[PDB]
Design a binder for these strands. Structure first.
Ligand SMILES: [Mg+2]
Ligand SMILES: [Mg+2]
Ligand SMILES: [Mg+2]
Ligand SMILES: [Zn+2]
Lengths: 292, 152, 104
RNA sequence: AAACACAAA
RNA sequence: AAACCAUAGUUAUGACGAUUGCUCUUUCCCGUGCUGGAUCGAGUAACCCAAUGGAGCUUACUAUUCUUGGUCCAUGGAUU
RNA sequence: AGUCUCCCACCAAUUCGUAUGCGGAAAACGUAAUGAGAUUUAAAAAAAUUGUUUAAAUCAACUCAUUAAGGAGGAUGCCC
């Protein structure tokens, strides 16, 4: 299974209105990723910290997976997730994660300063740590901090899709990726492609070749894209859907009804799962003996 | 409930003076002699006898009735805490009756202990208990409801 | 969690524990009786609420934890017997071989 | 970097 | 003004090549078997790194990201 | 690796003159036999270390409370 968790959405502020051309290009790139081959795609939405969060709940998510992606999935055959990246540099008093975290699925951060990095590593409840590979690194990253963070949770994310933008950004991207891999001890690394058009997408072999040329072994790339991507999807999904890892709202019967896999069945305006009666008290306990 | 409805059973006010009359009949029966006491009338006044008669040894007579003095200070409340449960679980129809007179401790002063277990087959017993079943009948099982144990 | 909604949850949980203490097996099996007794008491200790003494004294046993019940739903009697004083009034049970003595 | 402290965090 | 001293000694502990052995899988033979033998292939792990020396304790490691020994009133199948 | 402990001059003695279950120079050091215990407890919950960080059917693991070295006599159990 292959997971791409950083598909950008053509909108940065809530004052912006997305035209139909951008939605058509996104549909085209989703079809492109599906045709060659992919399993999980989670589109990204980026906002800054000093902005004014709207005091709404039903308007925080301009993604509407049921409206247009509901038009696309029945023909495509894959699932989409909504994620948000927080551009936090200065610890201002604007902090309303109690709404956007529960409204969205995955919550990431984009630190630029040292104090913001420290607070996002200690107190901020996030899922992935993304750095500005376009700009310069804030400081000399420490080892113990990143190790304690990946042991506590949040892992780092590397986006090879930004190196396809221009020429002058490739050197900075490689310099940042080298430092991240050297300081993170190659444990909590999740790879993603931040492409806005289907023309800047690649195959899994190109991805593993690029990362093995960067310095990370190919088997580790395969493992981090197979198990670690599924785990970072699962964590961010059940931290918002379910309670604090004690009670799950989804019951896996076979091999397809999974809290991250089953997305059309589980209700979202609420958290209930209305299923017909399939568990009685007169049926034989042993499944090998139980017959209908 | 378990006890919230158990101590205070009766809500009527016509009986007490005739209660005094049956107490006078009780002293009339207590006058004569030990044997003249128990020959015509089925009376028990011994806690061990109260338990052994309700144990299930003899099942002849259905209507059985207990008379106990309760809800007055400094009485063996812990010990009569289990007699209504015994009167309910007993297969005989056992009508526990409670003396609503705190001053009626002369019962405690006369026979033994303030309680009396009787078996209603005499026709005067019929006369006076067929009118009291019209009046009071309150006996339940805590295991059935258990809805009001003791909240707030 | 609303405290007004937590009071109802507390009452419901206490009622559920008290009902689990009863029906057939806690009367029959001493193990389930003692286990559910311990569970109910650990649940009532956390709520910082005292329990009435009129029931506290003569409710359960001290060796197993079955309710003291002598002979709508027919069940098993709890106690072997209950004698007079004989020197001091005692109560014996069925599950275990011990007795509890009280003095007048 | 390491190594040190009745520090500092 | 020195006491300057390590069968690593002060940000060093490099670079590839070759050999045996270890774990599984697709093969053939004697005797069933035998740290019995030979081809077609994959991998040699992770925590992590000295700065004066020794001992005790605790805490990180070994999932196609090498291994080994035993136990289990843990469950799963079969015989008595 | 770690914000843990201790040795790295002596003192027939204001110098832990400490024959105290065993080993040990010491050690917030290793282990052995029995009994008990769970914010209702001696103490874990509403100095260091550790992502989870002892138990709470039975086992396993942690904590605390007792058992001074050597020689001789009697009784019991095993090969005999
Ligand atoms: Mg070091
Ligand atoms: Mg250090
Ligand atoms: Mg060190
Ligand atoms: Zn008992």
């Amino acid at each position: 299974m292959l997971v791409d968790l950083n598909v950008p959405w053509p909108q940065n502020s809530y004052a912006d209105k997305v035209t139909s051309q951008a939605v058509n290009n996104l549909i085209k790139t989703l079809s492109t990723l599906h045709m060659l081959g992919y399993t999980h795609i989670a589109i990204n939405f980026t906002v800054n910290h000093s902005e004014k969060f709207p005091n709404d709940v039903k308007l925080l998510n301009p993604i509407d997976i049921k409206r247009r992606f509901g038009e696309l999935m029945d023909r495509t055959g894959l699932k989409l997730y909504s994620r948000i990246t927080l551009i936090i540099d200065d610890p201002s008093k604007g902090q309303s994660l109690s709404k956007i975290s529960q409204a969205f699925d995955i919550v990431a951060a984009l630190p630029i300063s040292e104090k913001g990095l420290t607070l996002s590593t200690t107190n901020l409840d996030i899922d992935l740590l993304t750095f500005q590979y376009g700009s310069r690194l804030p400081t000399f990253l420490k080892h113990k901090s990143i190790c304690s963070c990946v042991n506590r949770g949040v892992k780092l994310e590397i986006v090879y899709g930004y190196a396809l933008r221009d020429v002058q950004a490739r050197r900075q991207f490689v310099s940042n990726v080298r430092s991240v891999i050297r300081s993170s001890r190659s444990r909590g690394i999740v790879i993603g492609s931040g492409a806005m058009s289907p023309l800047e997408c690649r195959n899994i072999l190109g991805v593993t070749s690029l990362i093995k040329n960067l310095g990370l072994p190919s088997d580790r790339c395969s493992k981090a894209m197979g198990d670690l991507a599924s785990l970072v999807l699962l964590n961010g999904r059940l931290r918002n859907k379910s309670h604090k890892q004690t009670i799950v709202t989804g019951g896996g019967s076979g091999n397809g009804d999974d809290v991250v896999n089953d997305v059309q069945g589980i209700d979202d305006v609420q958290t209930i799962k209305v299923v017909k009666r399939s568990m009685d008290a007169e049926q034989l306990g042993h499944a090998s003996k139980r017959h209908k | 409930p378990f006890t919230n409805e158990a101590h205070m059973w009766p809500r009527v006010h016509d009986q007490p003076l005739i209660w005094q009359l049956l107490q006078s009949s009780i002293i009339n029966k207590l006058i004569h002699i030990q044997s003249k006491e128990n020959y015509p009338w089925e009376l028990y006044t011994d806690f061990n006898e109260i338990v052994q008669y309700l144990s299930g040894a003899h099942g002849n007579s259905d209507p059985v009735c207990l008379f106990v003095c309760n809800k007055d200070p400094d009485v063996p409340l812990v010990l009569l805490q289990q007699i209504p449960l015994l009167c309910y679980m007993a297969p005989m129809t056992v009508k526990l009756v409670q003396l609503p007179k705190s001053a009626m401790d002369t019962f405690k002063s006369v026979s033994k202990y303030g309680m009396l277990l009787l078996r209603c087959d005499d026709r005067v017993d019929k006369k006076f208990v067929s009118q009291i079943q019209k009046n009071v009948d309150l006996l339940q099982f805590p295991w059935l409801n258990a809805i009001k144990y003791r909240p707030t | 969690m609303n405290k007004d909604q937590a009071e109802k949850y507390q009452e419901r949980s206490l009622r559920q524990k008290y009902n689990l203490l009863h029906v057939l097996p806690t009367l029959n099996s001493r193990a389930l009786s003692g286990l559910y007794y311990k569970n109910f008491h650990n649940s009532v200790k956390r709520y910082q609420i005292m329990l009435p003494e009129q029931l506290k004294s003569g409710k359960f046993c001290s060796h197993c934890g079955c309710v003291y019940v002598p002979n709508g739903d027919s069940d098993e009697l709890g106690g072997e017997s209950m004698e007079g004083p004989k020197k001091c009034i005692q109560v014996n049970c069925l599950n275990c071989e011990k007795s509890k003595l009280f003095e007048w």
